[PDB]
From a paper:
To evaluate metal-ion affinity and to identify protein metal-binding sites for Sr2+ and Cs+, a class C β-lactamase (BLA) derived from the moderate halophile Chromohalobacter sp. 560 (HaBLA; molecular weight 39 536) was chosen as a model system. HaBLA, although a moderately halophilic periplasmic protein, has a particularly abundant content of acidic amino acids similar to those in extremely halophilic proteins. The crystal structure of a halophilic β-lactamase from Chromohalobacter sp. 560 (HaBLA) was determined to resolutions of between 1.8 and 2.9 Å in space group P31 using X-ray crystallography. Seven binding sites (site 1 to site 7) for divalent metal ions (Ca2+ and/or Sr2+) and one binding site (site 8) for Cs+ per HaBLA molecule were identified by X-ray diffraction studies including anomalous dispersion.
Author numbering: 8 to 364
Write the structure that this text describes.
Amino acid sequence: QTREVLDPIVASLMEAQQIPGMAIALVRPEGTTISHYGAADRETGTPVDDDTLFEIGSLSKTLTATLASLAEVEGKLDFDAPVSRYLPELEGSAFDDISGLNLGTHTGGGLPLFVPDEVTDRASLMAWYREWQPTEPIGESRTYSNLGIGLLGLETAASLDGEFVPTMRAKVLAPLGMQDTWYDVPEARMADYAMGEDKDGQPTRVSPGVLDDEAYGIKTTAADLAKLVRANLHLADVDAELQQAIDATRQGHYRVGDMTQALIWEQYSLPVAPETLRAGNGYDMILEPNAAEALEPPQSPRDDVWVNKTGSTNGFGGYIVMLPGKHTGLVMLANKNYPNDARVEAAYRILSGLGAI
C-alpha cells in the first residue's frame, strides 16, 4: 500500500547514511501509518518498536512554540510585548525591546545559536541576558538561536505562573494524548531509550545543559509526534483553545528569501524544488544571519505550502514535514545525526511517491 513506497526509500536511506534505527509516521486523512526499522541500539541490536524513545533535538521547539501560543490564546501572554514585562529580572536590558514574537521567529536582535560555557544555571543565564548587546537590527534579521526559543520557554512559564515541564505536560502533551513524551526519561522506560550514533559512529546520548528542556530536550515516539502533526492538519479531536494555539504557530511572520518563518515552523510555498529545501535547511540559513521582512498583517495558515522543522542532537536526527492543503504529514525519527540534505531528499521522494506533491 503506502508501505510499498516507503520501505525501499527508508532502506536505501538507512544503508546510504548508516542509520541503525528509524521510526516513521505518515499522517493521512484516512489514518496514520507507523513504521519501525532497524535497531534501537546498534551494540545490542534491540529492534525499534512502538515503545522506542528517540531524542528529537530542536524538534522540541515546536512544542515550546505551541505552549507559548496557548498562553497567548488564553490572554496570559502578549507576543508583541517586551519580554521584560514577564521576566522583570531583565528590566533595563536589551529585552525591553525584544518581544516573544521575535524570540519565536529568531528575529531577536542577533541572539546567538548556542548557550555560552560561562552560563551554567538560571542565575548565570539571566545575568548573561542582562549583559548581552544586540548585533543585528531587531525584527529585521534572522539568526537561528537556542537562547532565543529557550527564553521564550522561560517567558511562557512565567506568564502561566508555572514551571515549564509540568505546564507543558498539563496544557499541551496530555491533551494531545502524548503519554510517551519525556523531558527526563524515567528509570522504568530506560530500556526503551534508543542509543544515539554520532557521525564518527560512536554511541552518544544527550547531556544535560542549560535551556535543554526549552530548546532540545524531548525524547518521544513517532506516534506521539504524529499526534502533534495530526492536530496541525486538523485530523484530531482537540480543545478549541488548543486548536487555535496550534493553528497560530503556522502563521507566517517573516519572509526570509524563499522561506517564510512561522512560529518555529518554517515553510516554503508550493510547488517546491528539493534544492530550495536543501538550501533552506542548510548552512546559509542555519549558521548565518539573514535579512527578514516582517509580514505586517501576519498571514494566515496557508494550504499551499511545505512546512517543516529539522531537529538534532549528536546522536539523533529528526525531521517533520506537513502539507496542510493535502492534510498529509510525515515524521522521521532516526538514532543517527545524518545530513539535512538526506532528510530533505527522503521526505521529498516519499511524499511525491504518494502523490502529495
